[model samples]
Target chain A: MKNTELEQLINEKLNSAAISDYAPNGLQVEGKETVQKIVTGVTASQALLDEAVRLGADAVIVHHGYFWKGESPVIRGMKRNRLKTLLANDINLYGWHLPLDAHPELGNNAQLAALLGITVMGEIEPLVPWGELTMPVPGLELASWIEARLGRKPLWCGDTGPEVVQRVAWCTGGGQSFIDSAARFGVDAFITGEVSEQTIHSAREQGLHFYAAGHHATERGGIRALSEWLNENTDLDVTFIDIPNPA
Target chain B: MKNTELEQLINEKLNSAAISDYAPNGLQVEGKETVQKIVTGVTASQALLDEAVRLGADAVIVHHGYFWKGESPVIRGMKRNRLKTLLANDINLYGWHLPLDAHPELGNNAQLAALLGITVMGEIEPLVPWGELTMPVPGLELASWIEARLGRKPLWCGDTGPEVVQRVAWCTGGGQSFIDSAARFGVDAFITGEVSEQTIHSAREQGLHFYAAGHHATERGGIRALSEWLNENTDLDVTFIDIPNPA
Candidate 1:
């Protein structure tokens, strides 16, 4: 499949234009015209790109790409290293953010719900989805479930929460900021892939269970799902590689 | 007083760190520290800065400052013109965005509500406030009222709104994006300072009145209030200048 065709297909499936996003979505770094082998990962880190180069991948896709809203535009340092690797090797790079997060089936939020045995009820915002567990579980047990599913111990805060939780809201990857919305929307807990200093305060004060399940772990769903989608829908060979991140 | 002191003082007074904004909000351009003569305006446009220079102002304060999110940081072109003017004059430039817009008694939204005889009820979002008119008025009369209060013709849309409006929502300066939130929050009308192509569709489809008053005109209140504040609280000579802008 052509690299542009694959980008368009993913964009259409993700419905990129429906929601406002922090960074520009779709083909951010243009390279290889015809894409046959592709690599998928949680972020476009140096390690992931290096692995793509090693595997002779035609395209590299990830949940997190470059040019965030407040970042410096000048190419230097780590950014320079990453861009040099992609351009030097002619690997096309694509990213889907809010679009990938909100996509009903193949999205990170939906995949997280499926993995945790929760049924998605609705969204608090475009990125924050509220759901219910099939059976109510204690806060500690939920934490254990998260670690079992994502292969990383979650940072859980439940000092003020109820003994057990069933109603929950979640967003993957640095979505700790949405806790206020989830709490106000009346959720028993809020789960996301990362936590900040203030997030602990918000959870404690608001009396809701909070979990920071590793950003890289929670986000593996979308890229892997997208890779399988490309492998099946188009005549492309795709591989989902894990570049483990502590964040 | 030192310029840094002034920035810190105003940041505390406005509670700037609490609000997330599209641009950086404080001492955007460095100039003289001992600020005595200050000029406040709606924007840091070239025309407004020229007025500050003519006034021999030590610091120029505004509601809308420079370095908006996603803008190229390289100092060139029209940006060059603005930076050169500030640096050449050695006049400090400070901006307060969402904080200024949300200040209870001194904010642009509150000031607008007072000027037009609307009782501010509460906020749908931190920046978007809902209120009620003193008496129910026709959409056209409200349009006339906005022009009369702000001294600029407003672009009004009510093709699908009620004949008379009582409850309304408003935000100042490029806040047309909040129309959806207002409509969902159940307002008879929505008013903001700027319009985009999609704003018309949102207003029409949502069946709420929308008014795009001048961005400069609506935002003038915050800086003017801030200027008055500086004059009353500190040993500073402050002047509120009106460099009229059609936008």
Candidate 2:
């Protein structure tokens, strides 16, 4: 598959055009015309790009990509190095951002739900999904379950949550800001990948179990799922590389 | 003369109770029975409290106080040291956040307008005020003026702004988030005490000049003004101490 063709494929599959995002969603950095091998990750960090180079991948896809809104346009320092790596290696770079997180079948949110045994019921927002655990469990049990599934102990704040958490709402990476909506929507628990100083207060004050389940850890499933879909559907070989980020 | 009475006095003067804030307003930490000497600053950092102690102040007033929404409630590490300084010295700590910023005469925003020679016209929000420059000036000239007044070099982006600026909107401290509202309101320039990764794009794409004139520098005005107000109105001995922060 050609680099542009692959971007189009994922763009169509993710419905990228309809959604507005902080950065451009498709073919962020052009590389070789033909792509026979691809690498996918949570972010297009220097480490990920280096891995793509090592794997001799023709394309890189990520949830977080470059040229983000408000980022300096200057091609200097770390940004310069990343772009240089991509351009030098002639490895195509593509990003999906919110589109990747919203895809019903292949999204981070959907994959997270599947991983945690949550049955998706509805959405408080397009990106923020509300669901229920297959079995009602204590907040600590739920936290343990999340740790068991994601291989990371989540920061759980259940100071005011119910004894059992069945009804839940979540958004994948850095979605702690959605706690208010999830709280107003009324859930036993609210979960996301990252937490700020105020997130604890929102969870405690609003009476919901809140979880910060690692931004990188929770978001790994989506790109990995997408990689599997690509490998099964296309002749192109694809791999999902997990680069650990504690934040 | 009592610490609580001083809090009540300013609470009523600044109408602190009427506003919702990230942190509690007025007498966050109780100490002395009476507040005869007061020290005011932008934040309730250890440095500020130490200054209050050194000055033998009965109370410390600030715009950014402790126990902010979402901050770890645990009094350990830096928070521990800051609290110890206040408690051991028997100094009351009072904070007025949005109220101090919105006060017409002594607010960060209003005082900023007064400093930059902008005539206050109206408000986009209670804290975000929009006005006109007394004399329309080029973005570069305005940047120079901001540096001259604030005593800090501002990060100015005017790639898509008008050659001369008249209509302007601003919020003090970390108010780069208001750039969108300022842009939509059709201002030639937007001024705030801080800029974010997306602020440059907002300025460039929206055709408005944006300035981040130092958060600490912009906010110094409100607390200093409030100190002066206290000195004039009451028998309390007040002092303003500035601890420079580059960010």
Candidate 3:
């Protein structure tokens, strides 16, 4: 698809017009008009970019792209290497963060919840505010389901006080801080990617069953869903490449 | 005092020249060149600035001035009102944050500990590397001493398990996040300006007495010490002002 057309489709689908994000939301690095191949991953790390280049991918879409808040604006060190690789390979990079998490059909949180047989009750953090899911799922089943889907057992599971988790709360990718907020919101279980040492304490102490599914595994579904959406809407050839991140 | 002279003195004493900071370190908003009269407070809020203007003070120095990170850049709302008032009165504003906190004698954390009879040891949080305090205070006397010195009892206190507080960790003004770091560093008590709901839990669970000395009250001594240093070093007439913050 044309760069502008792809950008427009993404903007429209994700409804990114309203979200204020850390990095520029769409079309961060522009490339050719017609995209023949696309790669998707959790982060725009050097490994992912190299894989995209090796595959001759025209575009790389990821959950965590460049220019995060407090990230050094100076293109140096690992950042310089990543940017140089992207530019040299003629690979266009696009990132979707909060917008990706909030999208009804394609959001990482939503897709992960669906895959695990858990229903997303709503956003743990209401940055976008609209189009939130409010469904019910058993709290106890969530952990095993997530482990089965991701093939990685969580590092920590808190005692959620034997409650049948009808109301679930989640945010994809290193959202451990939202555990307390989820507890406050009265969610029986909270799930996210990557748990800190303190996160375990927060979960156990706050009486919330918290799960730390692998960050990469939790977020992989969103870009895949986006690729499917692209295939349905446009006449472009789209391929989803998963560059796994252990983090 | 000449603005340059005062800046030089502050920069020299606080070693502000060596450290990079979030907000500008000295003479952030210029006012009178000859700073004959000065007022010091915890924050450069509208209330403090108005008090300085009423007193015909040429310079106002504080620990918590405006333009914090993630604060809106626009001069509107409460921020706009404070800036407008400062500008109209032409009162020069100076602020020092972490630098003031880490200063051996003049830092808020240092000064507060001194008043409560806690000896200097080291820092609690090593993220800033030089931030936090390590000291020894008699565990039994620490809470009561803090109450007597600050005039308000702390909202939360706990015994440090089996150990008497020979080594205590503290940081003044919204340093509650340091409690965990302090616990990890094996300190007996953690003191800071403000407390969140979770802070109480951390204190209780971690087996450390956490003091929520008013953010303003805990921070006041730093500016006062800065004022005193300026008075002794330069021809500047410095005065300390107290503007209470319940937080």
Candidate 4:
């Protein structure tokens, strides 16, 4: 498939145009006109791009890509190296940020809910979703469940959480900032990928469980699902590669 | 004074302990026990730390210091180099972040107002101050004035600004996120140290003048003012170093 054609297809499917994001959504770095092999990852880190190179991939798609809003625009050092890898390898780089997170079915949020056995109820906002478990469980049980599913022990702060929680709200990957909204929305637990120093305070004060389930761990669902969707729906050779990140 | 004593004095003065900051407020990297000479800068980058070393200063004080929350706690590469500069030289490093910005008399907001000729008013938030310009000026005039005072040309977006401006809101050093609050507070102009891509859209849609004076330029005021205050009140030798940064 043509590189631009693939981008257009994914953009239309993800409804990328409607969302306001920190980074440009699609086709951030142009490369080969035609793409046969594609690799998807959580971030366009040096590690991930290197994997793409090794795989002889024609394109790299990521949840976190380059040219973030406030970063130094100078093409030097780490950024320069990453860009050089993509440009020299003749690989297309596509990024779907908030759009990927907000997609109802194939989004990180929806996938996370599905993995945790949570029934989708509603949203506090577009990106943040609130749901309920099939059976109410204690905070520790939920933590273990998250660890079992995501394959990483999450940083759980259930200082003031209910004895058994059924109601929950979550936004994957560095979405701990939305704890306040979840608290206001009246949830028993709020889960996300990363936690800040003050996140513990918010959890304690707001009387809800807060979980930092690892940024890379929680967000793995979306790209994997997207790769599967492409495999089923299109003839393109798509592969999802996981690059482990503790942050 | 002892290094910790100096930190305590400034902490009390700036009310550092009361404010929640992203980075540790005082003595981020411990060095000499007793300090006589201190160098103050906007950020504790290699350039500023090198200046402190060149001057043979006992302490380096800055608005931005090391060990920011959420950054990798690992000591490697740039972080390692910066830490080495401090530890190897036995230079105590102190950072007063939000406290320095929020200080009533010697804060970034206060100093910026003094420089820009905005009268003392109230705050939209602790860090964000709203006031009236002593003399109402056009958007272009205000932009020029900001350039002359800050010694750097500001990125001004006045697409939907009022014909003449009197009311203004400001916060120094990457405070562009407060534009929505400023707009909601009904300010004719909102000035800050940095601007994001969406900031222009906010200014245009909200019908207000937005100015992104350089982050280093806008924040230079607080540290400079603090140095002056230190010289006046304390026996320690203090010098303010200007490390010019475009952003």
* Interface RMSD after interface superposition, each candidate: 21.1, 11.3, 16.5, 16.4
List model 4 lDDT by residue over A1-247, tens digit each: 9999999999999999888899999999999999989999888877788889999999999888878888668876456778999999899999999888888899999999999999999999877999899878999999999999999988788867999999999999878778877887899999998654345556765789888887778888898888899888889899999865544
Candidate 1 ranges with C-alpha deviation above 4 Å:
B1-247
Q: TM per model?
A: 0.52, 0.58, 0.50, 0.55
**Candidate 2 on B1-247: residue-level lDDT in tens?**
9987888899999988989988889989999897798899888876778888888889999988878688567765456777889898888889899999999999998999999999999999777899999999999999999999989888788967999999999998888888877777789999997654345556765789899887787999999999999999999999999876554
Q: Write the per-residue lDDT of candidate 3 for residues B1-247, one digit (tens) a residue.
A: 6866777778778888776677778778888787788888877766677788888998888877767676457764455667777788887888887788778878786788777666665554532122223444554466666778887666545643425565566777767767766776766577776664335545655677677676666777788888888788767678888754343
DockQ (Cα-based) per candidate? Answer: 0.01, 0.04, 0.02, 0.02
lDDT of 4 at A122: 95
**How do the residues A1-247 of candidate 3 rate in per-residue lDDT, one tens digit apiece?**
6777777889888998788887778888877666868887766767678888888888888777877686458875455677888888778888887888778888886787677766444454672111222344445565666677787766447554445555567777767767666766666567777654335545654566777776677888888898888878777667677754344
- In terms of lDDT, model 3 sits at 0.69
List candidate 3 segments past 4 Å from native. Answer: A121-141, B1-247
Residues B1-247, candidate 4: write the lDDT tens digits: 9998999999999988988888889888899898999999887877778889999999999988877787668875446778898999999999899998989899999999999999978999878999999999999999999999888988788967999999999989778889877887889999998664345556765789999887778988899999999999999999999866555
Q: On a 0 to 100 scale, what is the lDDT of residue B173 in model 2?
A: 82
lDDT of 1 by residue, A121-141 (tens): 988887898989998899999
TM-score of 4: 0.55
Question: Which prediction has more favorable lDDT, 3 or 4?
Answer: 4
The iRMS of model 3 comes to 16.5
How far residue A211's Cα lies from its native spot in candidate 3, in Å, is: 1.1
